[PDB]
Amino acid sequence: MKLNISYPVNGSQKTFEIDDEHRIRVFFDKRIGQEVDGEAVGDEFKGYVFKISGGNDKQGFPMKQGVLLPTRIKLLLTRKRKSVRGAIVGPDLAVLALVIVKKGEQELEGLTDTTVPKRLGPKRANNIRKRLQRKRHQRALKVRNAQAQREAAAEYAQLLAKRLSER
Amino acid sequence: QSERAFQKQPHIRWYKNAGLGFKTPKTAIEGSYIDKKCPFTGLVSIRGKILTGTVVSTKMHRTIVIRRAYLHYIPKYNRYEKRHKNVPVHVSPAFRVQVGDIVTVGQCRPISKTVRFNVVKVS
Amino acid sequence: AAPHHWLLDKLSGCYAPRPSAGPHKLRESLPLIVFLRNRLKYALNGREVKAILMQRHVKVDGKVRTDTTYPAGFMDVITLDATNENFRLVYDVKGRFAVHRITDEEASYKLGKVKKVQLGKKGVPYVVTHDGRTIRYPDPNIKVNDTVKIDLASGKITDFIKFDAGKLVYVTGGRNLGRIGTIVHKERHDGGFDLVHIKDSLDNTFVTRLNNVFVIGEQGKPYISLPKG
Amino acid sequence: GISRDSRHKRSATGAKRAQFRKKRKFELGRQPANTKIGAKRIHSVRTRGGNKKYRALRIETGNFSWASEGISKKTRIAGVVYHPSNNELVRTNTLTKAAIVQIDATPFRQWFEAHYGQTLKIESSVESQFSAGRLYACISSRPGQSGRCDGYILEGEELAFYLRRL
Amino acid sequence: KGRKLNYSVQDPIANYEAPITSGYKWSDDQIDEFFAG
Amino acid sequence: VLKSTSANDVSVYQVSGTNVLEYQNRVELIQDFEFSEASNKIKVSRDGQYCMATGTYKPQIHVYDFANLSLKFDRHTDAENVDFTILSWTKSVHLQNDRSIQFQNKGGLHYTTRIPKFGRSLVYNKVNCDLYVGASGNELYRLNLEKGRFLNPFKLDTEGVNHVSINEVNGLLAAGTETNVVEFWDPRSRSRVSKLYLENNIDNRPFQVTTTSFRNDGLTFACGTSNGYSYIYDLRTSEPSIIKDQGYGFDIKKIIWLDNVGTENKIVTCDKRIAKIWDRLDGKAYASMEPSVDINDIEHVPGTGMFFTANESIPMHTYYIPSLGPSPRWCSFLDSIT
RNA sequence: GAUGGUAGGAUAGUGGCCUACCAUGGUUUCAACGGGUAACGGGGAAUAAGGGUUCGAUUCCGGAGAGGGAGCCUGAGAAACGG
RNA sequence: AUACAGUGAAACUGCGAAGGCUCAUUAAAUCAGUUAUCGUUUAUUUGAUAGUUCCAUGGUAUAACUGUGGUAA
């Protein structure tokens, strides 16, 4: 199997082609979200814990989180009949995705000891932290719209009053 | 004058006038008859055209079957074959129309599958 | 593919210009392309009548309204800025759109038949016409088929012509479409063939409908000027 | 529903050989949503542009109107005992227009005691329900079209007008 | 009583299902000695 | 691990409840299990898959494939339904709230016929193939699927019948009327055999029997009421019974056995809000299945310990009991998650 | 549902358009209802031509169909040539 | 022109395609005009048309993008 592993806070991710499936058999019949130990997948990474986060099997088909039935099934997604592998991992995964949420006993020259930075700082004002002439013009046009319309309406209602007095 | 459920009443005793040269009798202004689809109190409003003729049958209630013979200038066999027409019409509280009885009707708001006319006059 | 009213020569094309939506109906109007291009011939084709519409010479009913298929119906005063062109277009005696030339004090107004008077919402009397000028507050004695006179600078009714026996009426509709003379007879029926009847040179008689006729003035004094021959 | 057209049926002359047409969009008969009592759920269906139509199925908060003063106040629903536009409709206890349904009249008690002082001029066979709690009231509004349950109370003449029936 | 109880024969349901020979696993004598009383 | 409600020293679980980190540890079993704000009636077919759930507004048919964990289709039927059965696989017969009857096929809507009066219940006969339909009045009708005729309708008492069922191993036609009489007809003779009367000790008002059931021994009969009172019956001293008042007691609608799985002599009762389960020969509650909304009816999947309700909310609840039995082969990791 | 009445449902609303109840109606010799084609032809459906007298300009034959019936969705407008 | 500044592959966007073949034979029910809809829907065209306020600016969650990959696709 191949194991994709991601250390999210440092920003690191790498795949590891692990053969010798009795190392793999710790993950078997454990669906998405349930944690795992490093102790029964490896010896050189002990004290390790990985939250699984899906994985494409051979024939490339993804698993969506938490349905049932670790074979493939035909569901309705974003609505048409798409084929989707079950959330439970068994013997026939090509890659399996993992998030390491605690470093254990050995440094990794791919994951721990090497890291990438972020993209770019914020752009919004409140995101950087954590117009008034338009406020003049809006209020002035609003009070002028009132002093035009609400006076002109009564100014022809008084002409109706003149027609009613003359009639 | 109440043989059915569900508050047989006018729908807002009540009285109105369609105008346009057709009288409303005094029991149809102030009387105990409901006038659900008789256009003088009614719920319907008047429009369209007004047709006149005698009757054939008034067997069922709220069905006035008018006859209407009219002249048409036939050019084909150069003689007038005589016309005949039929139209069902709802009642009014002004005349129990029997056989004969040339009456007229005004077009309004299809009531059953085939009636758009309701009696407004008897003479 | 054309109507009869446009005075459209047959050797013109294949597709006829449908007018767009607007004040008047499709069946009682001519657009600006059939007005300017092939009737009084200020253009030669659709490209240059769109060019002068983008230049905005037209001032129909005192507003510009730059559009090719704008449905100018009855007596919308087409105003053109260059050479002070003021055109009131009415019906002739054989169904077409006779476009009379008028002057500025006559194109400062128009008239319109009232269609209905309503107590619509909030106690406001109400009046509509064939271009749909919903203008506020006429007198209570506006019946149907009377004639308001629009201001054409603001929208207000300035003068009013009452529909009664002995008024000068214009007939636009049916087999009497475009006749003037308004007096042999009056006959209001109760739903059809109801009208005031119109004379001829030998004072002949004619039948039409109420909605297919509308008043333009008095017996000898219409304040509209009319073309002659 | 199915249809709204005379083409599937016979006229006043007795014609035949129909075989007419594939039915259009504008013969649209939707399903009859028999509105019941439940928790308030209104389906917001579309028609004719943005003409949203409120199709109520499980409405409760009926605004029923005190007749002699015209006081439309809020109450619950119990059940319809008589409605012979379908005599099985009262067997199944739905809620349609012009039905006579029962109401616990406790806010009408509150309004009477609030704008008259004392508790109990009004008719005796509705004073019995003033005492007990359940009064008869007939639905005016259309939950299948406007989605609401409004109605008017039974007061005297209309009361006996229905009580002699059932 | 027009559409009410048309005692006619209808086309698609005339062979919609098919019967069974033995049917009840009991006997009819077991019916008689089941609810004699 | 899904949470469990408190009970009498026993555990139950719900999947697709009104409440059912949770988004990323979702425990959804059947995708698109939600209707248009209510539910009419759900039942599971005789074979190991293909459950059918009737609709609420623009009512549908909603066949779910159990070996695909999702929806197959939704045939929007013409009227709102009350009762139906399934006739194996693809055929099924329905009757709506109006007096009309639909025959769904693989293509769907094979016929629409009618009955002269408004109907309330339908059952099918496996032997000689006549569906019996109970309606309002003197009238309990037949539609035989052999030759499509009509049969000589069974003459009832005054008001009618709320439920009809035939016995399976021997065919004893039940008909739960309004005047407490159960009106057993014989599917052989087309005549009555008995008119058993139902009694109590409280006698609030003249209750009407609404639920009838049998099982596959052919000797007992489960009876209901319009009051929340289960009843058992045998031929052995058929005048008394054993009774079960329920703590809320409006109208019991679904009483079904456990006659094909282990932990025997147990029966499920179900009224409008609660569904409980108790044991025979004592009348003591094994468990109960209290949801957060009312119940339109229920059903129990055969061979295993799971239940499917039709309720008045947007989804339907499924109830798993890990002491009545296991979870089935298509749900065979429910025992691994909880 | 034939003909109408009362009420509800659905409607964009009128409407037996659909359902409960009720009445036994309605069209017709003053042509009901039914019979077919030079109904690949006809009805102005329209232009007419300065001599062709039923050739001589056109809209429409009827409704459907996007492999086959069924169900659903979108939109000012649809039971969509494009789901 | 050290927070933007022109060319611009590929992505969101506004719109485009805005009306095309064959098959079974309907007698004013297919069609044409006309009456009406205070019996009704309506984008666009046009004319009109808004008065409730107790002790200097509001929140994370997704793209495009990077990076690790699966699958014959």
The whole-angstrom separation of Cα F98 and Cα E4 is: 13
Query: Is-contact A87 A67, C-beta < 8 A?
Result: yes
**Which candidate from F37, F76, F79 shows the least CB-CB separation from D57?**
F37
Query: Is-contact F70 F64, C-beta < 8 A?
Result: yes
Same domain, D22 and D38: no
Q: What is the DSSP string of C148-183?
A: EEE-SSS--EEEEE--SSS-EEEE-SGGGTTEE---
The whole-angstrom separation of Cα F315 and Cα F34 is: 4
**Secondary structure class of A137 (helix, strand, coil):** helix
Tokens representing C225 are 């000027």
Measure Cα distances from C24 to A127, C31, C35, C93, C178 in Å. 56, 11, 15, 21, 17
CA angle, F154 then F155 then F159, to 5°: 115
What is C110-160's CATH number? Answer: 2.40.50.740
> In 3D, which of D67, D56, D63, D59 has the Cα closest to residue D103?
D63
List chain G nucleotides near protein: any atom < 7 Å from a Cβ.
1-21, 23-35, 47-48, 63-65, 68-79
Same domain, D26 and D88: no
Residues preceding chain discontinuities in chain F with C to N over 2.5 Å: 20, 88
Interface chains of chain A (3 or more CB pairs under 8 Å): C, F
Return the closest nucleotide (C1') to the Cα of D24: G79
Residues preceding chain discontinuities in chain C with C to N over 2.5 Å: none
> In 3D, which of C90, C91, C89, C93 has the Cα closest to residue C78?
C89
Identify the H or E element spanning F334.
helix F334-337
- Amino acid at position D125, single letter: S
**Secondary structure class of F306 (helix, strand, coil):** strand
Distance from CA of E33 to the nearest CA of F (A): 12
Query: Is-contact A32 A131, C-beta < 8 A?
Result: no
**Secondary structure class of A9 (helix, strand, coil):** coil
Domain that holds residue A45: 1-117
Query: Is-contact F30 F69, C-beta < 8 A?
Result: yes
> In 3D, which of A153, A110, A113, A80 has the Cα closest to residue A3?
A110
Q: Do residue A160 and residue C137 have CB atoms under 8 angstroms apart?
A: yes
Task: Quote the crossing angle between the two packed helices D124-132 and D106-115, to the nearest 10°.
Answer: 110
Cβ count near B104 (within 10 Å):
17
The whole-angstrom separation of Cα F59 and Cα F82 is: 11
Query: Is-contact F48 F7, C-beta < 8 A?
Result: no
Same domain, D45 and D21: no
The whole-angstrom separation of Cα D61 and Cα F258 is: 41
Locus of tokens 């007596």 = C75
Q: Which residues of B68-77 are buried (b: 16+ CB within 10 A; e: fewer)?
A: beeeeeeeee
Same domain, D99 and D39: yes
Phi, psi of C53 (to 5 degrees): -75, -35
Same domain, D35 and D70: yes
The whole-angstrom separation of Cα D57 and Cα A135 is: 47
The whole-angstrom separation of Cα A26 and Cα A30 is: 9
DSSP state of F329: G
Q: Spell out the alpha helix ranges (H) of B18-57.
A: 26-29
Please report the sign of the dihedral spanned by the C-alpha atoms of residue F20, residue F24, residue F25, residue F30.
positive
Chain B residue numbers with beta carbons less than 8 Å from the beta carbon of D162 are 5
Residue ranges per structural domain of chain C = 1-105, 110-160, 163-229
- Amino acid at position F68, single letter: N
Distance from CA of B102 to the nearest CA of C (A): 18
Query: Is-contact F118 F136, C-beta < 8 A?
Result: yes
- Residues pairing with F265 in the sheet: none
Name the closest residue on chain B to residue D5, using Cα atoms: B113
Residue F74 falls in which region: left (phi positive, over 0), alpha (psi -120 to 50) or beta: beta
Query: Is-contact C187 C195, C-beta < 8 A?
Result: yes
Cβ count near A25 (within 10 Å):
12
Q: Say yes or no: B20 contacts chain C, CB-CB below 8 A.
A: yes
**Which of F105, F128, F146, F168 to mutate to test binding with chain E, by most E CBs within 10 Å of its CB?**
F146
**Secondary structure class of D106 (helix, strand, coil):** helix
Q: Is D32 exposed, middle or buried (0-12, 13-18, 19+ CB in 10 A)?
A: middle
Distance from CA of E5 to the nearest CA of F (A): 5
Return the closest nucleotide (C1') to the Cα of A6: H68
Same domain, D85 and D24: no
**CB B63 under 7 Å to nucleic chain G:** yes
Q: What is the DSSP string of F48-86?
A: SS-EEE--SSS----EEETTTTEE------SS-EEEEEE
Return the closest nucleotide (C1') to the Cα of F108: G70
Resolution (A): 8.6
Query: Is-contact B90 B36, C-beta < 8 A?
Result: no
CA angle, F41 then F42 then F46, to 5°: 135
User: Is C1-105 in CATH node 3.10.290.10?
Assistant: yes
The whole-angstrom separation of Cα F52 and Cα F87 is: 12
Same domain, D43 and D89: yes
The whole-angstrom separation of Cα F35 and Cα F30 is: 13
The whole-angstrom separation of Cα C164 and Cα C186 is: 9
> In 3D, which of F63, F146, F133 has the Cα closest to residue F104?
F63
> In 3D, which of F309, F298, F268 has the Cα closest to residue F286?
F268
Query: Is-contact F305 F320, C-beta < 8 A?
Result: yes
Same domain, D61 and D80: yes
Query: Is-contact B66 B53, C-beta < 8 A?
Result: yes
The whole-angstrom separation of Cα D59 and Cα C101 is: 68
Helices (H) and strands (E) in chain D, counts: 4, 7
Phi, psi of D102 (to 5 degrees): -100, 145
In the CATH hierarchy, which fold is given to the domain comprising C163-229? SH3 type barrels. (2.30.30)
CA angle, C116 then C117 then C123, to 5°: 150
The whole-angstrom separation of Cα F300 and Cα C166 is: 90
Same domain, D43 and D23: no
CA dihedral F201, F204, F208, F210 (to 10 degrees): -80
Cβ count near F32 (within 10 Å):
16
The whole-angstrom separation of Cα B39 and Cα B120 is: 8
Name the residue closest to the C1' of G76 by its CA: D49
Q: Report all structural domains of chain B as residue ranges with CATH numbers, in order of start.
A: 1-123 (2.40.50.1000)
Domain that holds residue D8: 1-30
Q: Do residue C140 and residue A167 have CB atoms under 8 angstroms apart?
A: yes
The whole-angstrom separation of Cα C147 and Cα F130 is: 78
Q: What is the DSSP string of F246-294?
A: -SS-S-B---EE-TTSSS-SEEEEEBSS-EEEEETTT--EEEE---SS-
Query: Is-contact C219 C182, C-beta < 8 A?
Result: yes
Query: Is-contact B109 B44, C-beta < 8 A?
Result: yes
